[PDB]
Ligand binder design. Structure first.
Ligand SMILES: Nc1nc2c(ncn2[C@@H]2O[C@H](CO)[C@@H](OP(=O)(O)O)[C@H]2O)c(=O)[nH]1
Ligand SMILES: [Ca+2]
Length: 104
């Protein structure tokens, strides 16, 4: 079963931890990759009910299993905070415009 389901993409907790670790590392080094400069600040316009405190940062999680290194970020993102705590997993899939919805 999927720990997180983003559209047709299935993710396990291990997939999320691996992606989060990569994104947090770049965050601590102040380095960014991709046209959207990930890891990027996530303002939570959607108003998701995250249990951990902000600031939040979004980092792409890929359905291929590989860690994001630039290029197309796809539609899914892992959101983490300054303490390297997981806030949630979100996606543009099934969301209007440039908004996000949570993966179930
Ligand atoms: N939907 C959404 N986009 C945000 C938020 N904070 C920052 N953004 C950024 O703003 C852009 C959308 O206006 C997003 O790019 P993306 O659409 O390429 O993912 C994303 O990087 C937020 O809270 N919600
Ligand atoms: Ca996987």
């Amino acid at each position: 079963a999927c720990d997180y389901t983003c559209g047709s993409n299935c993710y396990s907790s291990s997939d999320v931890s691996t992606a989060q670790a990569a994104g947090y590392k770049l965050h601590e080094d102040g380095e960014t990759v991709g046209s959207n400069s990930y890891p990027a600040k996530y303002n939570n316009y959607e108003g998701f009910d995250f249990s951990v405190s902000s600031p939040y940062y979004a980092w792409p999680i890929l359905s291929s299993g590989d860690v994001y290194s630039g290029g197309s970020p796809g539609a899914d993102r892992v959101v983490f905070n300054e303490n390297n705590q997981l806030a949630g997993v979100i996606t543009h899939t099934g969301a209007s415009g440039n908004n996000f919805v949570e993966c179930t």
